[PDB]
Structure formats: C-alpha cells, structure tokens
Amino acid sequence: AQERIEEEVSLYGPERHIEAVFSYLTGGRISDACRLAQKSGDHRLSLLLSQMVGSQEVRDLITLQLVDWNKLQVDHYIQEERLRVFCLLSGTPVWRSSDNRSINVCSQLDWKRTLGIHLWYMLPPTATVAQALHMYEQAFQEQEGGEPYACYPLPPYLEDCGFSFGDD
C-alpha cells in the first residue's frame, strides 16, 4: 500500500480532503495520514487513530450510537459523510438501516486493502489469517444464499477491462 498511497497523495490534496481521508482509511496508514491531518486541522481523527488501533470497545460504542440514531430517525437528515466514515472506521463496507438506507464506502477497490481492512477493523485482531480469508470468501461468495458484500480477486490488467458481473 505504500506505493498506492504515494501515487494517490498527488491526486487528492487540500481541496480533495474528503476523498483523501477516504483513501487513507481504505489503505490503513498512520504516519503521513496523521501528519497531514495535524497539518491541516483534523484533530478528531488524529486522536481517534490510537483508539481505533486495537480495543473494539470504541467500535461497539459507535455502532450502538448509530443504532440509537437509526431508531431515533435522524439519519434522514444526517449527511452520508459521517455515516460512511463511521462505517469505514467500524470496518463494514455497506451498512443497511431500518429505513431502507444503504450507506456504502466502496471497499471493492483493491482486494489487498479489502482484506487488510477486514482483518484490522472488521474481524478482531485475535483471528488467524486462515479464518480471515475464510470470512472474506464467505463475504464475496455466499453464506446462506444472499449477495456478495465484497470484491472478487482478479488480475490487475483484468480489472482494467469490464466484464459482465452481478451481485449473484
């Protein structure tokens, strides 16, 4: 991810702060991300990075707060920015609410970054790589007859051309 982030920092800078933070969260960087955050003026993410690194208590608390907000019916007025950054912080790619609201963070970019996020934020750090890849396979395949909520590993030159794929 070092090369990816070093070629992506030049595409999104100051005015592209939202997409820059999105790329940083999808990659899973700490050093230069926190450096740019503290240089611009983002102290909340700089303080929350250490709480996100380990200890799923904050993640469970944020999930409970999101559930309480969905019950109080305020997500219709709350913009999708905070919802999607909370989803990226928790680790889920797509979040479904009780009001037919599907907030997606688009985790189908790179399979390496997807697996890294699934191993770090989604699954607890006490899970082996075998269980992590099994959960990833159940995610982008099927568990009980549903839809894949991830991406399929394909060659990099093959992802350039489009193919007839669906959510089946």
Binding site: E159, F163, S164, F165
Partner: peptide, 9 residues
C-alpha cells in the same frame, strides 16, 4: 463508466 468497468448494476 460502464465501458471502463462493466460491474455494479
């Protein structure tokens, strides 16, 4: 977008 990537209905 569809021509560059034939995914996502």
């Amino acid at each position: 977008y569809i021509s560059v990537q034939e995914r996502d209905p």
